[PDB]
Design a protein around this ligand. Sequence first.
Ligand SMILES: *Cc1c(COP(=O)(O)O)cnc(C)c1O
Ligand SMILES: *Cc1c(COP(=O)(O)O)cnc(C)c1O
Ligand SMILES: [Cl-]
Ligand SMILES: [Cl-]
Ligand SMILES: [Cl-]
Ligand SMILES: [Cl-]
Ligand SMILES: [Cl-]
Ligand SMILES: [Cl-]
Ligand SMILES: [Cl-]
Ligand SMILES: [Cl-]
Ligand SMILES: [Cl-]
Ligand SMILES: [Cl-]
Ligand SMILES: [Cl-]
Ligand SMILES: [Cl-]
Ligand SMILES: [Cl-]
Ligand SMILES: [Cl-]
Ligand SMILES: [Cs+]
Ligand SMILES: [Cs+]
Ligand SMILES: [Cs+]
Ligand SMILES: [Cs+]
Ligand SMILES: [Cs+]
Ligand SMILES: [Cs+]
Lengths: 396, 396, 256, 256
Amino acid sequence: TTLLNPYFGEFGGMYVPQILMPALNQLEEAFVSAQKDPEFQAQFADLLKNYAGRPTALTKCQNITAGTRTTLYLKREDLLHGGAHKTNQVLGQALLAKRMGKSEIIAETGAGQHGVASALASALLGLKCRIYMGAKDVERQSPNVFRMRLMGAEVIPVHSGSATLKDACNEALRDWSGSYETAHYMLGTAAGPHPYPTIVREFQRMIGEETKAQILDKEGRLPDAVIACVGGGSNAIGMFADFINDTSVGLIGVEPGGHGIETGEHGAPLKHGRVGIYFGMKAPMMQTADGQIEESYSISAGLDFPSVGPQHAYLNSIGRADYVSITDDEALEAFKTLCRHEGIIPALESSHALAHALKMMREQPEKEQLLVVNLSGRGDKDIFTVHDILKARGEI
Amino acid sequence: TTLLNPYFGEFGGMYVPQILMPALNQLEEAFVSAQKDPEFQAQFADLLKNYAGRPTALTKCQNITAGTRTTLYLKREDLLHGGAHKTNQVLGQALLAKRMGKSEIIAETGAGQHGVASALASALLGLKCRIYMGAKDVERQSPNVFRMRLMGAEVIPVHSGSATLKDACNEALRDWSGSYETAHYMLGTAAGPHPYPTIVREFQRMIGEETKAQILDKEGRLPDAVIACVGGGSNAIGMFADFINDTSVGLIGVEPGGHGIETGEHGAPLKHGRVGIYFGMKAPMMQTADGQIEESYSISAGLDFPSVGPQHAYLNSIGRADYVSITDDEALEAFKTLCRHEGIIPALESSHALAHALKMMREQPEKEQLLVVNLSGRGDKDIFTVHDILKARGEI
Amino acid sequence: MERYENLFAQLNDRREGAFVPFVTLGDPGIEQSLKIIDTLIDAGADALELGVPFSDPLADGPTIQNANLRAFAAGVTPAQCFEMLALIREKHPTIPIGLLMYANLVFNNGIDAFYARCEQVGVDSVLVADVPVEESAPFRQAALRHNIAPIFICPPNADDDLLRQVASYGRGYTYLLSLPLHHLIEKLKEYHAAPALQGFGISSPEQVSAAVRAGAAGAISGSAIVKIIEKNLASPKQMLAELRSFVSAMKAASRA
Amino acid sequence: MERYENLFAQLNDRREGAFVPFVTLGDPGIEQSLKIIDTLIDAGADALELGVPFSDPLADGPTIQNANLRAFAAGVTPAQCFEMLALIREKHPTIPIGLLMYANLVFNNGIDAFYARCEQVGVDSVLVADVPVEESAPFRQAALRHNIAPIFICPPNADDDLLRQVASYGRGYTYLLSLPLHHLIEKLKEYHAAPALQGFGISSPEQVSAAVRAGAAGAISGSAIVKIIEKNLASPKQMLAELRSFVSAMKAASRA
Ligand SMILES: *Cc1c(COP(=O)(O)O)cnc(C)c1O
Ligand SMILES: *Cc1c(COP(=O)(O)O)cnc(C)c1O
Ligand SMILES: [Cl-]
Ligand SMILES: [Cl-]
Ligand SMILES: [Cl-]
Ligand SMILES: [Cl-]
Ligand SMILES: [Cl-]
Ligand SMILES: [Cl-]
Ligand SMILES: [Cl-]
Ligand SMILES: [Cl-]
Ligand SMILES: [Cl-]
Ligand SMILES: [Cl-]
Ligand SMILES: [Cl-]
Ligand SMILES: [Cl-]
Ligand SMILES: [Cl-]
Ligand SMILES: [Cl-]
Ligand SMILES: [Cs+]
Ligand SMILES: [Cs+]
Ligand SMILES: [Cs+]
Ligand SMILES: [Cs+]
Ligand SMILES: [Cs+]
Ligand SMILES: [Cs+]
């Protein structure tokens, strides 16, 4: 029995060992209660405004669209404390942990952004934080590991399976099954078993609500489309949620195409994977023919989640949202273009969304369209990655 | 003849070769005109809000003051686009360049933050940007150099004198003396020849204006003191300006004490240097006994300007503002403390201001005081520096 | 499921508990795994629990995580595991064989088709480790259509509603993971549950006898057998000796 | 300043321009610098402009930036430069000696004290390169109290107000850096300015004659002399030969 539907159509559910079902039920009840509690909402709004810096700007980018009939706005989640949208929902989930009388946080991380976001939220709110990270990820994300430790978090390398993100995902769940009376599992995207896809959407939906109010103020109408990159689905569902019922507004999610869909080296399960059951949910997966879970590949480590949130799979199935892919080279071009023409260094994750908007513009330059890209994060973190590619291509 | 007084008491002036006086006079006239022009003010406000993200949060930090009678707020310039307060005034000066019909920007940089800020402003506003940087600075600031080049700026290493910041300062002035009909010199702090100390203050004073409105809303009274680090003086004068006439509000500027004032390895000219004439101004300088200009030393490259803005020297002389120093070790402690207890990674520059506020609290923990620290920037940039010290101390 | 019904009836007549070891199929390789399994049987295993290597064994601790890795290092696939299962059944007509599966391996090519292949090769039960009772309907329906017992875990944090659900929906045995112990066992009997096998921490003979004394039908050694494999990789001969020794001792502890 | 008055009167009687080379004191070392300076005089310099090495020569191009660096590499200090100046004056009674200074070196130990030491060692003029006329008052007042001519630059971007200020406040000579050229020179004369020396780009004999033809009192070679030093560091003997050759040619170009 649950209070809320655990499925979006056929996608979603609660595919966890029995021992974890009380933990999920507890969390669902606390969430439902919190959502009706004005004191909780006021505390959440206070942290979002005065600690994280909401509302975030909506920037009109003129140079990049000059001479076309595209008007492009960027929703500036890159300006949020922490430098990415992840901060919004970790603050919400930390408050949920407190609501449930918990003093400890468990989190998983791949690229390390969610580890950093969990560690910052935990430091602010006086929670003891432990972060699981695939041993391979630990080795290649030294800056993020150090940030987590500076913030007082314990970072625990995971050596099982492929020693990457999906493996940390498993290990976080294993710890929680023993510790859930005192610890909250702070899941890092809008995926996993119910109630996480719902919670993460509702704790990110201020992105779309603000976007709507800002575009109405600035342009006097809704956007033709809002465009967001899709790793696990959190920034995209946060942008999309408030517009779902505005049926004239296109919802475009962009998965990483990596070296090209046809190469198989990509991270686009929603459009090019196969539905499976893993990490507590029924959803499109990167998997082998015989059902072993595989890794997502992208230039952007942040888009490597090998599955996608169930609500995206559902919105796609009914035709409410459209999903596309952008390759590493396309994302790299968009990254350089924004730096040079607007003086904003975008996360390589966000650069996938921008690349698709630039394609919409360039393919049909006399089409009048009002687009918003969710600029999910800033790209300081990516400059060595970009440097290395540019040198190797002999762009020097 | 000038429109405005070029001096703050005995400090300041216009100590440039004759050839540069028309350039300064032109800039002063354009500034005075701009300050009366509602269209200019509206354009500036638009960029500040919708591109840079103003207003910035004022965060109450509870964990760090728990059990004392200090209430501490941080003004979150770390959340501004670019990750430091420098962005405010580069946007103002870029608009001044346009007002004067200029299409090109010249800037100097030491640590590289001002180069990056100049390059971003120039990219947004379609100005061709060239940045002078001491060759030694180029070598040790590879990430910032790459950011400038990504944003389309030309970065020019300077090999004269000591090949550092003061040398880039000279070289920027040398270029401008030939190119001022088409190029604007975007000076990076509240120092140099008039009218720069005035312009930079007025294009940073939104920091203090916002702080005042935010503290009145939150606490119903003005702060006991506002506290800011002092490299050249821009973030500090931006915080201070709106409070100058509120004579109950303490204005505390913190210079870098480096390894300790008594070692001579510091960057505290206002309190421990000697008045001299250099970089177009009469002001306290780091200099040898026979009058050669010397370097500032600090753990934080951003506080290495070897002089200080003339308005600070003036406010100190009349007793309106008090200036203190904080050593590298004190700043490092404040850096670790904020990370662990509030989940904010502060710039090592800003960590000097925070360290002094923590000393005010710890020295007199039962003194009731309402303090604001200007958190001038974020400290992602500093994590390798901090890592290296911690390893070398065997903190691992 | 009939093989469990027959086993428990036979054990009950002998006032005897069941001892059930777990191993990962194909750990440390297909040939050695087949030898390991025949050794467990000869040494006195009453039933087998057999895992199919999976990339993400959520319900599993370090010991079994590492067994999965060994099997993958040996290139073991689900298809190879099903060939092994058919051979195991062909050698041993009455021993109940249960699989420990993860949901994606069951769903991958169709849930019904999965249970049909289980029936073809002679499997008696399936426990799907990441399917709670709330999600179990298509799995238990397919199992029963193919004469396979659906096995459910009764966890430490069970409640009355869960006991009644596990009791109603399960067949073959109830997988007990340690309300007090004697109370769970008594309540499961009251609700006419499949006979309980204790699966928590069964690493020594005294724990087998304790399980039977508590009222359970027997005990499952979830990881101790795999630990003996892990410890003895360099000597297959010694590995088999130590497995035989261990299973013999554990089975003795079940006997009246 | 009297030495300039006497020089110009003497040159005027000979219908002759002044040729004035610049060098950095102590470049490439104190001893060689003294030899360089005596060579310039023997070769026909009418007056000298001498720079004191400073950490931050704002008004200076690459050639002189590098001369400063050489002098610093040789450990040259302002005190050593003043000792050099006293020796130069002791050797040569009538040649006008002008310094090119930066403000901090003048202000460092007191502006008045600076000009008093200039007078003691026999200096005739001081140009402070980073002090515009608008800031000049304490510098020109101290200069005149110590019988030192304050030298001002008339830049390409001069205006009428500046011409009148430079004309009123300057003594010794007006430093012209190329309103048209002939117009500036004529206007400075109209305003009774100190005689003009052209200081822009004087690198060849034809530019010296052109300066005189334009109505100027002479020409200053701001950097060409230093370039000959830079080019010949490895051979002091050749350095002196080439300096003598160059200054001889440049001076010849000034003669009626
Ligand atoms: C984590 C991250 C993403 C991808 O995660 P979603 O859950 O799909 O939003 C995208 N952009 C940035 C900047 C991120 O940090
Ligand atoms: C540049 C910088 C400073 C020092 O410059 P001021 O002009 O003294 O403000 C301080 N903090 C940060 C974060 C900076 O980037
Ligand atoms: Cl992450
Ligand atoms: Cl590091
Ligand atoms: Cl640490
Ligand atoms: Cl409006
Ligand atoms: Cl699919
Ligand atoms: Cl800088
Ligand atoms: Cl780099
Ligand atoms: Cl580049
Ligand atoms: Cl209020
Ligand atoms: Cl002083
Ligand atoms: Cl019994
Ligand atoms: Cl016995
Ligand atoms: Cl003539
Ligand atoms: Cl001749
Ligand atoms: Cs456009
Ligand atoms: Cs995806
Ligand atoms: Cs307090
Ligand atoms: Cs300073
Ligand atoms: Cs039953
Ligand atoms: Cs005169």
